[PDB]
């Protein structure tokens, strides 16, 4: 404790500052020159961030409280001369002379008045005098004033200029780290009116720095991972023009302004498609911006590139629609055949070879329904790229043997065989078509739409499945003919043929299991804020289901075609439109929870989550709205995959404690679809916790629910070491978990991961985290999986080709115009970085290094090295163009 003798600051600034009645009066040099000399001594000595207890900042205030208390809070004759060296050293050490209630009266000391500007003497500062003061303003005072009456006198005018200097001031001491701290000021300042702050912050950033656009930019998107309902709406459209005005990246326009297409209104990114047609700069970044526009997050954008520029800068359109899709063909065309793919691996039905030597002899498993899974040994494995000439003779005999829905099934696996095909997919179907069969014809033809899906080249706009539908007096001629064209034309929202199949629902002909999948199929073309098909459906709903609703074939298929396409929207109006037309009773009100959160896919609304559990938790009303709470928990399944890790940990904490530990029918029947929709890559946490409720099937229930969860627990990153789990559960499931209902199921899930050994992308995630269909096609399976004989008759149409919106797998590709390059890549882990510093490592697993077609994987954000020039997009996406250049290598 070395004090006393050297407390000059605690003496001269403790005497002259003390006697203002003696200093301000009767001593002009005493009030003026000693206070000014205490303003350069305190501004230069007690005014910078240096420690807790400065020579003055803590020491001149210990008795400097009353010392400051009467030097100039009370003279009542203040002039335009005694405001520079009078509020001169009393004003700076204010925040620690007073106490925590300084936020209400934080305007009398340094918010009172500075001599000219905050930087006139707060340029030699970090945050003590003026910076943290200004933050203390915009925290509380500008909010309470800016709630209702902003423009009063001085809490807005001086604030207007102060915000411009504080904004660049976060980058001013050093344009480096608290750059992102500035959005703590622009966001906390006028939370709702963020565009009022980002309106000046946008151009101030436009003049801020060319190199300083991307990190505070990614901090804007950082604060746009989720915000207040009016802030995710606002700061996202704020987020767009930064790479448009100051920076010029503009290849994250098409996909990362799909960030800002739907959350604002209907037409914003169609005017941003016009933005594409206005930003007609060099065609490599243009070409790859438009690459995603067909089969990477959306399609049907091929009626806007046929203007006068149709030479190459508008001839990129059809290249996107089917030609670059044809390079998706060549992907396995010349890459997977060369690397790792013969047409028929056939090692799933053969990898189950050693099991016969455990327990003695075999040949006891002779269940015919297992042959249903026998079709998927060919169906899944050829799922996109691969054919079979008499390699399908098992479906040749079993197709001509029994199991009519097995004829539809085996006929349906052919489209999975020839997927992403336009050349001969119909030529394959034609031979196996002329057999006088409804399941075979309606299955292969329905598979044809699977074949031309995302193509948009002429395959059958009205040729194949329209002619299939025009003979529909009956079975899956009437039933499955409408499914394949909606599947094929889901990515391309053509309204005409959907109007052709609107009379499918408007017919009112007996469509027991045909009408629900009708609204599902035409909904595949265009449902979701469905203007016409929601109409034609729930007209027939108020006609028939108003008077009969027993099974989920009626009730469980219509509301899906109320609000299931536009699950990327968040406006919540179509819940009002479609919902209010069916506001009758509880059973017809099972749809009430459908479109409510079907406009709530992923975002920040934990208050919507508490209204997602607290209303209907258990309630035990003796089996009346148990399905209502089952579906309400079903809507707990979304808003957990893309709140960006926010909903995941709390969903695993909640589900791991409530349902499986102490739960009800809701948990013992359906509670695993949260994992059948939540994760798609697989990790040891759920990968072990699920079989803790899976190996123990709890068959007292309709055990094919835990067996249903068996299937979609194989939903993880394609191949894994989980063959131990699935294989062992197939051995214990040989006798137990009878093959009469599970023999197709166990190998069904066994083979799903290992189908073409790649190609699982329906996660509603692209690039790093945005959205993209993945729900119209995936979801109807998990909704179609309740428990029982919907795996028997009605199910075989959906269960086979329910979800087919998988967009390949990987990104290792060159596409330099000749397409010969093999540029040195370097596989790693997903980029975990948001903000730590400037020299911050993008990934960690730098060990692996590849050059050509490889493995994307779920958590991977590979960049590469050597600067062979990745100028096309620099934001990934698996068909980079590689504009080559020697940028000082």
């Amino acid at each position: 404790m070395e004090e006393g003798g050297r407390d000059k600051a605690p003496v001269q600034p403790q005497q002259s500052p003390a006697a203002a009645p003696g200093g301000t009066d009767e001593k002009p040099s005493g009030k003026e020159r000693r206070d000014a000399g205490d303003k350069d001594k305190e501004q230069e000595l007690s005014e910078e961030d240096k420690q807790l207890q400065d020579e003055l900042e803590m020491l001149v205030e210990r008795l400097g409280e009353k010392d400051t208390s009467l030097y100039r809070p009370a003279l009542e004759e203040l002039r335009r001369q005694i405001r520079s060296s009078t509020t001169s050293m009393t004003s700076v050490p204010k925040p620690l002379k007073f106490l925590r209630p300084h936020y209400g009266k934080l305007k009398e000391i340094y918010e009172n008045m500075a001599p000219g500007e905050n930087k006139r003497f707060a340029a030699d500062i970090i945050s003590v005098l003026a910076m943290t003061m200004s933050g203390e303003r915009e925290c509380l005072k500008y909010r309470l004033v800016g709630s209702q009456e902003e423009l009063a006198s001085w809490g807005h005018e001086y604030v207007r200029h102060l915000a411009g200097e504080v904004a660049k001031e976060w980058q001013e001491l050093d344009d480096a780290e608290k750059v992102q701290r500035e959005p703590l000021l622009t966001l906390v300042k006028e939370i709702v009116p963020y565009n009022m702050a980002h309106n000046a912050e946008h151009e101030a950033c436009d003049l801020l720095m060319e190199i300083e656009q991307v990190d505070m930019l990614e901090k804007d998107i950082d604060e746009n991972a989720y915000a207040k309902v009016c802030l995710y709406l606002t700061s996202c459209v704020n987020y767009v023009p930064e790479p448009e005005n100051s920076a010029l990246l503009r290849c994250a326009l098409g996909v990362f302004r799909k960030f800002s297409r739907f959350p604002e209104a209907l037409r914003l990114a169609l005017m941003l498609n016009d933005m594409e047609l206005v930003e007609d700069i060099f065609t490599s970044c243009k070409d790859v911006v438009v690459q995603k526009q067909m089969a990477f997050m959306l399609g049907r954008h091929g009626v806007f590139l046929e203007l006068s520029e149709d030479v190459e800068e508008y001839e990129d359109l059809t290249e996107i629609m089917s030609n670059v899709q044809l390079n998706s063909n060549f992907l396995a065309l010349a890459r997977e055949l060369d690397i790792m793919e013969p047409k028929v691996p056939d090692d799933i039905y053969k990898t189950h070879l050693e099991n016969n030597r455990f327990g003695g002899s075999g040949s006891q498993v002779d269940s015919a329904r297992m042959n249903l899974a026998s079709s998927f040994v060919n169906g899944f494995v050829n799922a996109a790229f691969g054919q079979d000439k008499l390699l399908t003779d098992d479906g040749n005999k079993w197709l001509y043997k029994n199991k009519d829905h097995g004829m539809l099934s085996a006929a349906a696996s052919l489209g999975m065989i020839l997927l992403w095909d336009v050349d001969g997919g119909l030529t394959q179907i034609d031979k196996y078509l002329y057999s006088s069969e409804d399941y075979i014809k309606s299955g292969a033809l329905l598979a044809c739409g699977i074949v031309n899906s995302g193509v948009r080249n002429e395959c059958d706009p009205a040729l194949a499945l329209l002619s299939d539908y025009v003979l529909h007096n009956s079975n899956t001629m009437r039933l499955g003919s409408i499914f394949g064209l909606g599947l094929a034309y889901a990515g391309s929202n053509r309204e005409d043929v959907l109007t052709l199949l609107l009379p499918v629902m408007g017919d009112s002909k007996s469509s027991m299991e045909v009408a629900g999948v009708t609204a599902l199929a035409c909904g595949m073309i265009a449902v979701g804020s469905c203007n016409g098909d929601v109409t034609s459906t729930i007209l027939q709903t108020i006609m028939e289901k108003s008077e009969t609703e027993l099974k989920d074939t009626y009730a469980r298929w219509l509301p899906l075609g109320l609000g299931l396409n536009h699950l990327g929207k968040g406006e919540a109006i179509e819940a009002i439109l479609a919902a209010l037309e069916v506001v009758s009773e509880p059973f017809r009100s099972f749809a009430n929870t459908l479109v409510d959160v079907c406009a709530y896919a992923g975002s920040g609304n934990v208050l919507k989550v508490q209204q997602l559990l607290h209303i209907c938790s258990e309630h035990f009303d003796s089996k009346e709205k148990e399905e209502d709470k089952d579906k309400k928990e079903k809507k707990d399944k979304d808003k957990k995959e893309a709140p960006a890790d926010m909903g995941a940990h709390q969903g695993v904490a909640v589900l791991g404690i409530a349902l499986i530990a102490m739960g009800e029918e809701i948990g013992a029947e359906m509670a695993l679809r949260t994992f059948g929709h939540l994760l798609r890559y697989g990790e040891p946490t759920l990968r072990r916790a699920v079989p803790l409720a899976l190996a123990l099937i709890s068959v007292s229930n309709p055990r094919l629910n835990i067996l249903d969860t068996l299937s979609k627990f194989s939903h993880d990153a394609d191949p894994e070491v989980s063959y131990n789990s699935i294989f062992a559960m197939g051995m214990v499931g040989s006798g137990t978990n009878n093959a009469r209902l599970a023999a197709m199921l166990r190998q069904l899930a066994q083979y799903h991961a290992k189908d073409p050994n790649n190609l699982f992308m329906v996660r509603l995630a692209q690039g790093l985290t945005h959205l993209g269909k993945g729900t119209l096609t995936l979801c109807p399976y998990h909704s179609d999986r309740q428990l029982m004989s919907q795996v028997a008759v009605a199910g075989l149409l959906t269960v086979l080709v329910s979800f087919l919106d998988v967009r390949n797998i990987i990104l290792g590709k060159s596409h330099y115009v000749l397409y010969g390059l093999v540029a040195a890549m370097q596989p790693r882990m997903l980029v975990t970085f948001d903000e730590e510093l400037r020299p911050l490592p993008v990934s960690v697993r730098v060990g692996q290094a590849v050059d050509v077609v490889g493995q994307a994987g779920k958590p991977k954000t590979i960049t590469g090295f050597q600067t062979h020039t990745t100028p096309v997009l620099l934001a990934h996406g698996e068909r980079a163009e590689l504009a080559t250049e020697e940028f000082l290598p």
Binding site: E48, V188, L696, A849
Partner: protein
Amino acid sequence: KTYGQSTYSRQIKQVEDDIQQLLKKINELTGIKESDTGLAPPALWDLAADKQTLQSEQPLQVARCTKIINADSEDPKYIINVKQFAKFVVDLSDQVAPTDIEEGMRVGVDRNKYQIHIPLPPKIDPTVTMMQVEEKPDVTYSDVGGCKEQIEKLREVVETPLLHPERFVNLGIEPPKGVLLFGPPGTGKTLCARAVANRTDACFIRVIGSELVQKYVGEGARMVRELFEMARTKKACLIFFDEIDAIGGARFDDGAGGDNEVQRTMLELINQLDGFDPRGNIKVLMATNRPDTLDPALMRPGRLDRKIEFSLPDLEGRTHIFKIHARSMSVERDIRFELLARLCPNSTGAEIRSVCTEAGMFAIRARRKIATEKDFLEAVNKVIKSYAKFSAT
């Protein structure tokens, strides 16, 4: 007392904290059985405690492990010891194929009838299991700038034949499997080791030079046996030694009662390195600070082929290392380092990082966000004078 550094300073802090504690209070409120002397929490073994543990009970017996000696003619007729129990003439169970039961094998056999059930992985002790790195630190080749000749020479040896076993066949040559590194300390050898191990694409094996000296005779050699065994097993694996001076530096015999055991061990490394049926696909990287007092047997080529050294940067290696250790840190846009390196005529990359991190300590003590450029000026000044009147120098 304090101030509000960012607007709602405690307003997020205690709000986070009390719900964090409420996470606990949920758990103790619901009732959690903790500290049951080494078990699992009941939430996940309640639905695993069923007969799907008897599936591990009855289908899998005790399976006592034993060791194989030899076989016989026309039939297995296997001769096996248990470990210390007794030696028997036993036979395999029908669950196995009479192919992968070769001699010197650890195999699981029934306790009742003494029939072989399972082939096992051979034995490998923890003392060497722990020196296998099993991980690759993130050390990029760019971080080792300033030794362009050295990294090239090493690249020609440990990298090019492996990743491109084509040129050496098209010309008909053999790569020099034996590399030694040396030079003054604090220079870029370790860094080179970690970086090569980064892109190692191989079973890289650390070796600490003093780990071999032991209390009993020959046991250290017994280490070396397991070393070259795991090497020959793991195809295309790398070995690193470090300060091998402890091993076999000389053959002091004027008064032959000094060091002999690690001399014998060094001889074992001699034989199991080269001589009598060479190893095949293995690469050896060494490094020492005094490569002057070593037994010339290691100095013979074939074993220690290349002698790469790391020197002291004249003026420009220190510049580039200013670009290496000064890059991964926060500074103003007013950089310049030639002025710096012209001020430090003799300093290593390690001292370069010392000046870069010492740069931050001023703003760190002076309550600043980042190391401003001028603050870095102050840093190099205090390290110019500090290194000028340094304690040892």
